[PDB]
Specification:
The PDB classes it as immune system/rna. By secondary structure, this protein is mostly loops. It is 12% helix and 11% strand. Helix 1 links the parallel strand 1 and strand 2. The structure holds one RNA strand of 37 nucleotides.
RNA sequence: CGCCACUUCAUGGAAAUAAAUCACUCACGAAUGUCUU
């Protein structure tokens, strides 16, 4: 799986919107795979990876063109999942 | 370090329940038991 952030950036670049960044979106794990296009045979497998560690409402992408930014809104695609508490609990004792 | 907010604003249960439903007193008292022609 590749996180939805990768395809969010790719879709926005597919339109006449250019995003701020010196490095291309990261693909895979290797040290330098900053690529904009999927490998070759077919597109990567994508999923909403960041949901399992806490559901958000908006994704802000902050276009390079100043004083304007792109907002991606997350909705449950049928009103079933409105929130999700993070499943990790941090504890501080002594 | 800079920049930046969205979301949620009541449902479910109880909506009357028991006790007393008339009680006591008086239930006839006194006069007349024939009178006047």
């Amino acid at each position: 799986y590749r996180w939805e952030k990768r395809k969010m950036k790719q879709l926005i670049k597919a339109r006449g919107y250019e995003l701020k960044g010196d490095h291309s979106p990261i693909s895979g794990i290797r040290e330098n795979d900053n690529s904009w296009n999927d490998p070759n045979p077919n597109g990567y497998n994508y999923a909403y990876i960041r949901a399992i560690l806490g559901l958000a409402e908006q994704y802000e992408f902050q276009l390079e063109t100043p004083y304007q930014k792109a907002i991606v809104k997350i909705k449950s695609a049928n009103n079933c999942i409105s929130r999700y508490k993070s499943p990790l609990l941090f504890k501080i004792i002594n």
